Coordinates of C-alpha atoms in Angstrom, one line a residue:
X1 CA 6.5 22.2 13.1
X2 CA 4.5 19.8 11.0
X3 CA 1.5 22.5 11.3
X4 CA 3.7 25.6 10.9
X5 CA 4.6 24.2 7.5
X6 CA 0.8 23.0 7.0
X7 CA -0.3 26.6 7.4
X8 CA 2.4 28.5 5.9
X9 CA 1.8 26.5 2.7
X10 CA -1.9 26.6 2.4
X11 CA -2.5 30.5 3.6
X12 CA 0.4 30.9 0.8
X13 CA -1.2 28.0 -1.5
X14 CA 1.9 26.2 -2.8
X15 CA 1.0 22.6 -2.3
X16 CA 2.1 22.4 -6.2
X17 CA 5.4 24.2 -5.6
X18 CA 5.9 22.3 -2.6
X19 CA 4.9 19.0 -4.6
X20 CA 7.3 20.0 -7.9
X21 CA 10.2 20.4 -5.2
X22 CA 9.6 16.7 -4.3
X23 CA 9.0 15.7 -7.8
X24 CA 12.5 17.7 -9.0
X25 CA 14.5 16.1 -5.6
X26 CA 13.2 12.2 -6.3
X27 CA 15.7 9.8 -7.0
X28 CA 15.9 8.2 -10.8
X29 CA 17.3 4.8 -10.6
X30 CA 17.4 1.9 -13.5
X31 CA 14.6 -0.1 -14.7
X32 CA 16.5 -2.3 -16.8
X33 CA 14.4 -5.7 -15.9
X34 CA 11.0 -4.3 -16.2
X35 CA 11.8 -2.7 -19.3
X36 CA 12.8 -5.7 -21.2
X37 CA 10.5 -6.6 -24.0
X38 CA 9.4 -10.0 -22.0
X39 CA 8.1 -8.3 -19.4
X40 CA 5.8 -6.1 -21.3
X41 CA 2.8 -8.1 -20.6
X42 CA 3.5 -7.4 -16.5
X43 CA 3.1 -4.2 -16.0
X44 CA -0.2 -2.4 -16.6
X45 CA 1.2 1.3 -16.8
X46 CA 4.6 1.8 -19.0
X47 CA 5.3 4.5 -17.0
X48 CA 5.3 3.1 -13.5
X49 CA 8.2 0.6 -13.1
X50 CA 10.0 -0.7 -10.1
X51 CA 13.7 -0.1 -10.2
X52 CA 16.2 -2.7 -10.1
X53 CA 17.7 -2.5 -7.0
X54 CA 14.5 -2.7 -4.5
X55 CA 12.1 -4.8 -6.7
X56 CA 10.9 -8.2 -5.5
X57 CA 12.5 -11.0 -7.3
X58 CA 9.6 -14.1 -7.6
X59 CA 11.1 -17.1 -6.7
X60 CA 11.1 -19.2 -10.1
X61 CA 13.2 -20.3 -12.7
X62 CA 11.4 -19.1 -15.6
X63 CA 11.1 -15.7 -15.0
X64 CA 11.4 -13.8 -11.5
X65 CA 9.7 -10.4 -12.4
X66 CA 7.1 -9.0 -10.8
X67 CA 6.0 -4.9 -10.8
X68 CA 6.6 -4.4 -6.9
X69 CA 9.1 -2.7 -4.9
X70 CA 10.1 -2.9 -1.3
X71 CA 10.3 0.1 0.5
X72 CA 12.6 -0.4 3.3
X73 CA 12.3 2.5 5.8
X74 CA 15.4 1.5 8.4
X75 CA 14.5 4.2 10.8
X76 CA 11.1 3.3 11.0
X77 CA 12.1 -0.2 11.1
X78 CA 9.1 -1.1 8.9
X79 CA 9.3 -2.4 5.3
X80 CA 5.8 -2.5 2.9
X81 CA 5.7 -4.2 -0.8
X82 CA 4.5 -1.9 -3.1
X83 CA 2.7 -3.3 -6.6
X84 CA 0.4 -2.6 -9.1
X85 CA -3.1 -4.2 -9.5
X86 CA -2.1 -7.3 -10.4
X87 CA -3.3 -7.8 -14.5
X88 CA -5.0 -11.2 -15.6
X89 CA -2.0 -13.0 -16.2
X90 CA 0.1 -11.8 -12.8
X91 CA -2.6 -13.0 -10.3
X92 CA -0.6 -16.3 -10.1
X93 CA 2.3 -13.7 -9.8
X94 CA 1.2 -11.7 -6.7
X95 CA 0.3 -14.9 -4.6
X96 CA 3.4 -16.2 -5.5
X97 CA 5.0 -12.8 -4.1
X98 CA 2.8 -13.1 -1.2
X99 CA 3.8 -16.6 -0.5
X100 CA 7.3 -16.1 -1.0
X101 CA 7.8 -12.8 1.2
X102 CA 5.9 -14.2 4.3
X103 CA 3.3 -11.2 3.5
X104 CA 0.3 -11.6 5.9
X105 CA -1.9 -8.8 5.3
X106 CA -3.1 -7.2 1.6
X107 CA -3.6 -4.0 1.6
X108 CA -5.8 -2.8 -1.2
X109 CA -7.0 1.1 -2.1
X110 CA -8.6 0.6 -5.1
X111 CA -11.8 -0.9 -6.6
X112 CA -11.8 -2.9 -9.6
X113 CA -13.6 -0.9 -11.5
X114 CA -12.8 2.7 -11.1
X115 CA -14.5 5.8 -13.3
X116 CA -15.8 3.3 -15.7
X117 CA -12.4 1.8 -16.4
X118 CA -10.9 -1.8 -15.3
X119 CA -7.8 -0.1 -12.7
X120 CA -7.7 -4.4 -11.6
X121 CA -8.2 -7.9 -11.9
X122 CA -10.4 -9.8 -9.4
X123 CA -7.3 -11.6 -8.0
X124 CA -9.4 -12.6 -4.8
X125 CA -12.2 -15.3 -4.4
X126 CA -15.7 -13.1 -4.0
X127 CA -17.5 -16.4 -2.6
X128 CA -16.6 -19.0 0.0
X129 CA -18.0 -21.8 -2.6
X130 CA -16.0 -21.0 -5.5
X131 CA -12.4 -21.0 -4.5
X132 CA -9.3 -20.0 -6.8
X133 CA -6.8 -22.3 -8.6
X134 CA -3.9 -20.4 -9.8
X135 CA -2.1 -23.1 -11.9
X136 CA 1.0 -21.4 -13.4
X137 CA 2.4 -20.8 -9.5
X138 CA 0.4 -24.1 -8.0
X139 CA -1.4 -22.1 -5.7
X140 CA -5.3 -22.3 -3.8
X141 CA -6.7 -19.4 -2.6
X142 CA -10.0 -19.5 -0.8
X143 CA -12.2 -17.0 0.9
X144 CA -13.0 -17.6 4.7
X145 CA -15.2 -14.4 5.7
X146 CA -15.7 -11.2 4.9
X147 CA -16.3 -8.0 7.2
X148 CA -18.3 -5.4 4.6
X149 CA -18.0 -1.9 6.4
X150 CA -19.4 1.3 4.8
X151 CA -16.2 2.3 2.9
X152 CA -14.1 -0.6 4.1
X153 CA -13.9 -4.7 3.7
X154 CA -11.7 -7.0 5.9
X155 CA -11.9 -10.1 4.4
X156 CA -9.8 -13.7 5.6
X157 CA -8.0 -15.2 3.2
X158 CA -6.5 -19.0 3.1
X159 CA -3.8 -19.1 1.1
X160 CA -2.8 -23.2 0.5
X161 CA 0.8 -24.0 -1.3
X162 CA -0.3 -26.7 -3.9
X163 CA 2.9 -28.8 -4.0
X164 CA 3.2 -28.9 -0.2
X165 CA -0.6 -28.5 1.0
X166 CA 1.1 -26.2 3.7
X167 CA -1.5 -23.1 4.8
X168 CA -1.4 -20.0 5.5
X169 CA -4.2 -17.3 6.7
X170 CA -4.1 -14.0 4.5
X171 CA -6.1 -10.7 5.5
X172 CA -7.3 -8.5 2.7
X173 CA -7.8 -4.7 3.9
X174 CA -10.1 -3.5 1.0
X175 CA -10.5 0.2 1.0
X176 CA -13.2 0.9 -1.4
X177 CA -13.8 4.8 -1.2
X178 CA -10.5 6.3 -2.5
X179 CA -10.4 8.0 -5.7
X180 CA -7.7 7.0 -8.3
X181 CA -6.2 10.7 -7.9
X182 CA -7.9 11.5 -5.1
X183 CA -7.9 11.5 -1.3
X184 CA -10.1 9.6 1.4
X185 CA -12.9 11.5 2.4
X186 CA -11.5 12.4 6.0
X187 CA -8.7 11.7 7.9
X188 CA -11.1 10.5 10.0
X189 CA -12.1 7.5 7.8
X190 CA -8.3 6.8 6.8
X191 CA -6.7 6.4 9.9
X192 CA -9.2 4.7 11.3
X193 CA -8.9 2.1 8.0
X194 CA -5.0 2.2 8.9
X195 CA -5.1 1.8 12.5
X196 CA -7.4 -1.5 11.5
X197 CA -4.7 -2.5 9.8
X198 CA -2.1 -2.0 12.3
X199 CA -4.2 -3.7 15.0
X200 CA -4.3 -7.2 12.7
X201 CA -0.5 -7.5 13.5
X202 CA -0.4 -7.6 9.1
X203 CA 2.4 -4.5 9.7
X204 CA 4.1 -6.7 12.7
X205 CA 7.9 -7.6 12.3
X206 CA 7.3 -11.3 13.1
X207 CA 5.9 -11.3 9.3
X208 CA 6.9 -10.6 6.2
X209 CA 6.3 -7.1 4.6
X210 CA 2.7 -6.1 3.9
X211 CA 1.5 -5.8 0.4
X212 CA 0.2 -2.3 -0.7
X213 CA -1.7 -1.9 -3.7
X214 CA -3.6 0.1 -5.9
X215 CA -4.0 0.7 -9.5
X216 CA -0.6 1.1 -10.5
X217 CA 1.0 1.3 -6.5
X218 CA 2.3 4.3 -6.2
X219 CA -0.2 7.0 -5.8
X220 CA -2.9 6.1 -2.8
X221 CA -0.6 3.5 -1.8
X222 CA 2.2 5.9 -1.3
X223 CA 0.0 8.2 0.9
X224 CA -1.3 4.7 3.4
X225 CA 2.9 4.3 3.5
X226 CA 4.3 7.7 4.3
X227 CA 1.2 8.5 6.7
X228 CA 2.2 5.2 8.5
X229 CA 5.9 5.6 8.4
X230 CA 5.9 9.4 9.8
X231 CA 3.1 8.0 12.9
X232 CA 5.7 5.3 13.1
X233 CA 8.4 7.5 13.6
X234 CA 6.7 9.9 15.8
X235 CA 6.5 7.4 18.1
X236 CA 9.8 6.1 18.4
X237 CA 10.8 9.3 19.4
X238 CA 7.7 10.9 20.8
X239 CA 8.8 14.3 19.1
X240 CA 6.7 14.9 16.4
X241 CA 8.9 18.3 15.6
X242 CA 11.6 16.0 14.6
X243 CA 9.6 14.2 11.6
X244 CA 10.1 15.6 8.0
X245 CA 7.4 14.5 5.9
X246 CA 9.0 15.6 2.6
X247 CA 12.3 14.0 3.3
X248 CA 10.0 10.7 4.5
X249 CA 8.8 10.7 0.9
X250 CA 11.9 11.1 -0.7
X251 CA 13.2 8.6 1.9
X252 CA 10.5 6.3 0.0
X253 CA 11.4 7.8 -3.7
X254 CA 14.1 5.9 -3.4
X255 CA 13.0 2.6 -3.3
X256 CA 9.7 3.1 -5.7
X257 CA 9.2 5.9 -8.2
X258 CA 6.1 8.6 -8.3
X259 CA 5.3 7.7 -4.4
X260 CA 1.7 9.6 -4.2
X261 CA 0.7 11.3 -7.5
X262 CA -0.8 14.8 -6.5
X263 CA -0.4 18.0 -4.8
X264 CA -3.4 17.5 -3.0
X265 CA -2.2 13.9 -2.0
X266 CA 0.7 15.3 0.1
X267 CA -1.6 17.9 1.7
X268 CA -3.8 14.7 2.7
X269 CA -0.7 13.3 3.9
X270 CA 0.2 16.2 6.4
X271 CA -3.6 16.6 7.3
X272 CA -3.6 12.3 8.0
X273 CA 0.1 12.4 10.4
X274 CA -1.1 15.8 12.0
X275 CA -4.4 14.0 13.1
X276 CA -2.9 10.5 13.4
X277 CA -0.1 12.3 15.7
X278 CA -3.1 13.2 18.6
X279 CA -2.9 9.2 19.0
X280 CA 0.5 9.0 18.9
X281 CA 1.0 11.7 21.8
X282 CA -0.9 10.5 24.7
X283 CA -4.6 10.4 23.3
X284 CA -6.3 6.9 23.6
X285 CA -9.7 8.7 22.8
X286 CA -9.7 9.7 19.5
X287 CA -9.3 6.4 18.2
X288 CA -12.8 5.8 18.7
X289 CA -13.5 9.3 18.0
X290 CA -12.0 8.4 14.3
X291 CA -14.3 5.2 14.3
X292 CA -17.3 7.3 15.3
X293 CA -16.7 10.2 12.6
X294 CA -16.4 7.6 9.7
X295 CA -19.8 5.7 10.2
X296 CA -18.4 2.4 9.4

């Protein structure tokens, strides 16, 4: 089902037809607040914006805007906060977001700096000794331990509320071998970096939605979503015939715009839920087989 249409498009080769038809079918909604001229200076890209209805509202006076979107997938019965790489003067801004939503895992797919450009600001403490202060939200942030894999990095995060010294321990899921418009090397190597993710609990209903990220949120961290969404609903049900990936991501569309950014992005995505699926339906095996094929 999910192969049938693999096949038929790549012996035809109309990923980019395929793609458009997504592009042409996504939903256009109103992006009134992150248009207005105050909010210029938070958001890095003009052109990626969260609409109105499904953005995250920081929980301040002053201003509540924030470039992040909840995608709530009701069937799934999984939500996931999609944002940008927070800029210089938003890092105060996404651990205030973090905070507020209950969030316990970050889930990031970029580097800081990618193809000799800055795609992020180094919102996270690289060194246990020197510890962050983020004064405009009143905010510590302090690094526990870090887990350096060969194209991955867990690292444990405290997170400590300023104004009520009340704590809170954050996981940071650094993938550090995805291409801005590009693809993981393998499915291999993703799902094994989502399935790490998944085992953490960070995805768990008894928190708050996870925070996906990379340069500007949409692209890579539309492809971790949809991959985990379609696994998610393929076993609910435990038909994988019955899971339409291009209606998943126009599911998504809704709540975020330009949800993965290439043709060859959605063929990853197929390629990561027809793997991912030999878990899903009875397997147990290939999850190490996964660990063993990306030489973490």
């Amino acid at each position: 089902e999910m192969e049938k249409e693999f096949e038929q498009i790549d012996k035809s080769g109309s990923w980019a037809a395929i793609y458009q038809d997504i592009r042409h079918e996504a939903s256009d909604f109103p992006s009134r607040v992150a248009k207005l001229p105050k909010n210029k200076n938070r958001n890095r890209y003009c052109d990626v914006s969260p609409f109105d209805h499904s953005r995250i509202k920081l929980h301040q006076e002053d201003n509540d805007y924030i470039n992040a979107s909840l995608i709530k997938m009701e069937e799934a019965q999984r939500s996931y906060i999609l944002t940008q790489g927070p800029l210089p003067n938003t890092v105060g801004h996404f651990w205030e977001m973090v905070w507020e939503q209950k969030s316990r895992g970050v889930v990031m797919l970029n580097r800081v700096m990618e193809k000799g450009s800055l795609k992020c600001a180094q919102y996270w403490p690289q060194k246990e000794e020197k510890e962050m202060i983020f004064e405009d939200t009143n905010l510590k942030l302090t690094l526990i331990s870090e887990d350096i894999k060969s194209y991955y990095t867990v690292r444990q995060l405290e997170l400590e509320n300023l104004t009520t010294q009340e704590t809170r321990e954050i996981l940071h899921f650094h993938y550090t071998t995805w291409p801005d418009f590009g693809v993981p090397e393998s499915p291999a190597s993703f799902l094994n970096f989502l399935f790490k993710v998944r085992e953490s609990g960070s995805l768990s209903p008894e928190h708050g939605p996870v925070v996906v990220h990379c340069s500007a949120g949409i692209g890579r961290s539309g492809t971790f979503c949809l991959a985990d969404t379609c696994l998610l609903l393929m076993d609910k049900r435990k038909d994988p015939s019955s899971v339409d990936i291009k209606k998943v991501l126009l599911e998504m569309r809704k709540f975020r715009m330009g949800l993965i950014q290439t043709a060859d992005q959605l063929r990853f995505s197929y390629l990561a839920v027809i793997e991912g699926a030999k878990f899903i339906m009875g397997d147990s095996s290939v999850q190490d087989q996964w660990k063993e094929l990306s030489h973490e």
